[PDB]
Amino acid sequence: PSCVMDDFRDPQRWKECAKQGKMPCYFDLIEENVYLTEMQCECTPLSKDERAQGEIACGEDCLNRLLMIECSSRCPNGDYCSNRRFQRKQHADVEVILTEKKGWGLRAAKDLPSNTFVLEYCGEVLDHKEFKARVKEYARNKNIHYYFMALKNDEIIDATQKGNCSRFMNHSCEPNCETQKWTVNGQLRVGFFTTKLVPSGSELTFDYQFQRYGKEAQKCFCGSANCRGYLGG
Numbered sequence: 001p002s003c004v005m006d007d008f009r010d011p012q013r014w015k016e017c018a019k020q021g022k023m024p025c026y027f028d029l030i031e032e033n034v035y036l037t038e039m040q041c042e043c044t045p046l047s048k049d050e051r052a053q054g055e056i057a058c059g060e061d062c063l064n065r066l067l068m069i070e071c072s073s074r075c076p077n078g079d080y081c082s083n084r085r086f087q088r089k090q091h092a093d094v095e096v097i098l099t100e101k102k103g104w105g106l107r108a109a110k111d112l113p114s115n116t117f118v119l120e121y122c123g124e125v126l127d128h129k130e131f132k133a134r135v136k137e138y139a140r141n142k143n144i145h146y147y148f149m150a151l152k153n154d155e156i157i158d159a160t161q162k163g164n165c166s167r168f169m170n171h172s173c174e175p176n177c178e179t180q181k182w183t184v185n186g187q188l189r190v191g192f193f194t195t196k197l198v199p200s201g202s203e204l205t206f207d208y209q210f211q212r213y214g215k216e217a218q219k220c221f222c223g224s225a226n227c228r229g230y231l232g233g
């Protein structure tokens with residue numbers, strides 16, 4: 001069984017689909033981080049002609065891009081700016097699929113070039129105390145899957161109760177994706193980016209080590225030749 005990201009925007013169809021196992025269990029779908037406890041680059045504006053020809057606005061040499069800072073609405077290239085991906089939700093084409101042993105996962109629905117933005121990892125942002133309170137509550141609940149992603153000092157993103165389809169990305173010891181932390185309006189965010197060409201139909205994975213927390217070690221079913229046997233601890 002598989003589904004498209006848009007299926008998750010229809011609550012009643014989702015809830016019926018999940019009742020039949022055609023979709024993952026319900027979560028609260030969100031498109032920006034929620035905090036539980038509450039500048040222009042120097043790129044030359046491209047001409048209309050340069051845009052027509054396919055030239056890229058705020059590409060590899062953009063001073064903002066070079067520091068993993070996204071441009072604002074005030075970018076010299078305005079609408080043309082290609083360095084506003086988190087903000088404009090310029091996601092890769094991906095599907096949510098049921099795996100054999102890992103629960104649900106994500107797979108490329110088209111060929112994805114190397115270094116393609118996949119999705120932002122959204123959820124509830126927690127401080128250390130809230131995080132520890134959540135770990136104990138989830139253990140008490142006998143939860144199987146964990147969704148704690150390190151963001152910064154004293155900031156953890158928890159996608160357990162609220163998030164988007166990024167929360168379905170499974171671990172691999174030999175992954176095809178990586179996290180990258182990007183500054184958007186002075187605020188840090190976390191997103192997934194391919195590290196190689198990902199052929200259509202392949203599962204999208206990243207290495208959880210040092211960035212995902214899980215209270216119990218879980219046996220790894222990644223299947224790589226170099227599998228380390230476990231994720232979390």
Ligand SMILES: Nc1ncnc2c1ncn2[C@@H]1O[C@H](CSCC[C@H](N)C(=O)O)[C@@H](O)[C@H]1O
Nearest residue numbers: 102103104144145146168170171220221222
């Ligand atoms: N390589 C792997 N081997 C075994 N379980 C994995 C895995 N990668 C992810 N998981 C499972 O998924 C959790 C991370 S959340 C990833 C989405 C999850 N598969 C889901 O169905 O909602 C882990 O805590 C573990 O329970």
Ligand SMILES: [Cl-]
Nearest residue numbers: 099100101102
């Ligand atoms: Cl599996």
Ligand SMILES: [Zn+2]
Nearest residue numbers: 041043058062
């Ligand atoms: Zn620029």
Ligand SMILES: [Zn+2]
Nearest residue numbers: 058071075081
């Ligand atoms: Zn720009």
Ligand SMILES: [Zn+2]
Nearest residue numbers: 173220222227
């Ligand atoms: Zn593994």
